[PDB]
């Protein structure tokens, strides 16, 4: 139990359902980003689509209390915030608030508290310079690297909700830029790409999975950060993502050990975007986008409904470190041992301290 578990179990979920709707795409998300800003949007909410939303975020309203998850991502944000000077990293919220509407003190007392938000005011009635505007802010707080979160044939909203993220970190253990060679990457069957492959021979964090058919390697970077490198063993791809859990990870932790290693890793540049609602309807997080939402908690002179959560991502990964960032918005409306990683693999990012889940990537061709 707690948030940081509650946190990867919808995480995982998530994962397993964008991989099993896009089989040959590279996926990349920010679980904590999408669990960040929905967790703010249930500040909105009440009754059964409030409790529908918590539910599917993994949380237990038996057992714990709104307030509770509140804190625990206040918390979160917190420790973001404070990361270490070695570390780079953004991780904020913002409201966009049409004229016509006022928010309720509560609700906004709430999101200023707990998450921090900015409230920006915005015009509505011209959808295009409002959805240039809050592109222009996520763009400039992941520093140009998610460009156009909104389009302008988007359904127009009243109210928007923002979550961004973003870091820059370097390798506790970088690999030798000089190393660095092309070899052959096995997309598929039929498909063989040329890559970069990045090579250093460490002493590395290694595991041999012995309950999953799977070997992985954990590099860190400085300001506490960790990234889980795994190898599905041949064919076996969905059976490990399948499996994944809290369970695992912590088994994981615990068998990683030491080990002399030839590491090949290729340099790894992909994105994701997505429209998140068909895949939240699959995890039962529905009630929210229908004609019977219940956002009486941002409002009780107009009834509210969520029209469109988006989110992309985006990871470089090289020789020195890692460079990533993500968003998610959501509109409302009137109602030694050799490893080569040359076929497809999982990278896991996390913080160690939290154990948030940052970045999830499933990586089909990483050029």
């Not at 949380?59 to 070695?86: M, V, Y």
């Not at 492959?197 to 590395?204: D, G, P, R």
């Not at 964090?205 to 599905?232: A, K, R, W």
């Not at 929210?288 to 409002?299: C, D």
Request: charged share 15%.
């Amino acid at each position: 139990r707690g948030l940081a578990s509650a946190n990867v179990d919808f995480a995982f979920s998530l994962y397993k359902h964008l991989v099993a709707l896009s089989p040959k795409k590279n996926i990349f998300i920010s679980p904590v980003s999408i669990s960040m800003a929905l967790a703010m949007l249930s500040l909105g909410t009440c009754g059964h689509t409030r409790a529908q939303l918590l539910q599917g975020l993994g949380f237990n309203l038996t057992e714990r209390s709104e307030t509770e998850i509140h804190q625990g991502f206040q918390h979160l944000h917190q420790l973001f915030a404070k990361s270490d000077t070695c570390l780079e990293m953004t991780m904020g919220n913002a409201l966009f608030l049409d004229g016509s509407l006022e928010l309720l003190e509560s609700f906004s007392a709430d999101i200023k508290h707990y998450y921090e938000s900015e409230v920006l005011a915005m015009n509505f009635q011209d959808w295009a310079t409002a959805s240039r505007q809050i592109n222009s802010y996520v763009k400039n707080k992941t520093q140009g690297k998610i460009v156009d979160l909104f389009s302008g044939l988007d359904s127009p909203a009243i109210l928007v909700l923002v979550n961004y993220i973003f870091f820059k970190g370097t390798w506790t253990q970088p690999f030798d830029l000089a190393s660095t060679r092309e070899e052959n990457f096995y997309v598929d069957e039929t498909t063989v790409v040329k890559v970069p492959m990045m090579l250093q021979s460490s002493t590395i964090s290694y595991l041999h999975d012995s309950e999953l058919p799977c070997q992985l390697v954990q590099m860190n970077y400085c300001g506490n950060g960790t990234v889980f490198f795994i190898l599905p063993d041949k064919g076996k791809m969905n059976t490990v993502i399948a499996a994944l859990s809290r369970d695992t990870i912590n088994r994981w932790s615990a068998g990683l050990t030491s080990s002399q290693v030839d590491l090949y890793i290729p340099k790894v540049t992909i994105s994701g975007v997505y429209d998140l609602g068909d895949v939240l309807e699959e995890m039962g997080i529905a009630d929210l986008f229908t004609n019977q939402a219940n956002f009486s908690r941002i409002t009780q002179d107009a009834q509210l409904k969520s029209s469109k959560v988006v989110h992309k991502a985006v990871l470089q990964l090289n020789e020195e470190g890692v460079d990533t960032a993500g968003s998610t918005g959501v509109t409302l409306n009137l109602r030694p041992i050799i490893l080569r990683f040359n076929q497809p693999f999982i990278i896991m990012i996390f913080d160690h301290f939290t154990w948030s889940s940052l970045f999830l990537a499933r990586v089909m061709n990483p050029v």
